[PDB]
């Protein structure tokens, strides 16, 4: 449950799926996905995938060495309090493609090197069903 | 059955999601990654689910003949109850997952780039597929 953690000792490559599957609480602010490469404390953050219920935004961002990069909004929220939710990030050789529902959400392309991934942590407002990683 | 066109191909990263529900008298069905429309065209991947031989047969198929067959541990389908498969491409081969587990690795044995096609047939009837 949260906060979820999942070692990735050998890293990922393309072809790397992560099924998140959860639940909004009824008064969630926002969660987080972060695809870290470390498990050290402010470890740097391949990828920071940030659903705002609060203020009805998805923020990407990443982190690198301690200072976080330019963040990038996805097009709304397509999470809603109460309602449950199923989440796969897929890495490819050129980036991140978020899949929300049934529906192609957002490609965040690689800041850092995929090969540098190490941890997935999830965090935040969120009752998670399910964390797997294909 | 069931058709998707993939015009620019498949890479690496990319899931073939296969939402549906397996009849109560289903014999089996298939899932194929063709290499074009025509008939007979190469299989880059046979994914068949056998329910009346209790079996899912992998497989591949290149100028009109068969590969040999690899097969999973066991059938993770049933008549009368849905199921949910991921095909995911890979650089090494194809990853399918059946419910919420790897279930085979199936390793490549035609370009994946070759892929253009995505059929779905046979005895099983379904709900939604998606390809991301």
Known sequence: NVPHKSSLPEGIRPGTVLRIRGLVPPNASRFHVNLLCGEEQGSDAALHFNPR??????????????????????????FQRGQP?????????????????????????????????????VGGDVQLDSVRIF
Do not use: C, M
């Open 53 to 78: 219920l609060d203020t009805s935004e998805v923020v990407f961002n990443s982190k690198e060495q301690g200072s976080w990069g330019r963040e990038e909004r996805g097009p709304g929220v397509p």
């Open 85 to 121: 939710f199923e989440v796969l990030i897929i890495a490819s050789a050129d980036g991140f493609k978020a899949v929300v529902g049934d529906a192609q959400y957002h490609h965040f392309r690689h800041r850092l090197p995929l090969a540098r991934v190490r941890l997935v942590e």
